[PDB]
Q: What sequence folds into this?
């Protein structure tokens, strides 16, 4: 019987191997063991985004955020999800929030978040046209 | 150091 962290790492390894439904199931089993861990939900939310399941991804972001209001990835995955759903204004504010939080937490993702922000703003602008 | 990655 695997542990919650064992299942999370198995999920992680499947994700890296691009096996998104398999990984999402592993995170589910992690959650069964310990439902109070934000990273299990943010990890699965990223699976759902890769699986085109935005509503599920949205729901997992909300579960994570209720556990950890400071989660940079929960805000970033939420904004990415909203971006693909064409909720442009919400998407940008959540990407901006992820940026502020990471800066506050001295987390280094290089130019990733500003890069995603430009992409999101470019898309909203092009969409307006 | 990559944002779109699992933890």
A:
């Amino acid at each position: 019987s695997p542990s919650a962290q064992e299942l999370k790492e198995q999920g992680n390894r499947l994700f890296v191997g691009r096996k998104y439904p398999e990984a999402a199931a592993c995170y589910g089993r992690a959650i069964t063991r310990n439902p109070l861990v934000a990273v299990y939900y943010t990890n699965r939310a990223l699976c759902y985004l890769k699986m085109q399941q935005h509503e599920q991804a949205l729901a997992d972001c909300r579960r994570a955020l209720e556990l950890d209001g400071q989660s940079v990835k929960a805000h970033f995955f939420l904004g990415q999800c909203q971006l693909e759903m064409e909720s442009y204004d919400e998407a940008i504010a959540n990407l901006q929030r992820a940026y502020s939080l990471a800066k506050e937490q001295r987390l280094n993702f290089g130019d990733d978040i500003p890069s995603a922000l430009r992409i999101a703003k470019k898309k909203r602008w092009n969409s307006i046209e | 150091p990559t944002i779109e990655e699992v933890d």
Q: What stands out?
A: Residues 123 and 129 of chain A are 10 Å apart (CA to CA). The helical segments of chain A are 4-16, 20-33, 38-50, 54-67, 72-84, 88-104, 112-128. Chain A has one domain: 2-129. Residues 2-129 of chain A form a domain with the Serine Threonine Protein Phosphatase 5, Tetratricopeptide repeat fold (CATH 1.25.40.10).
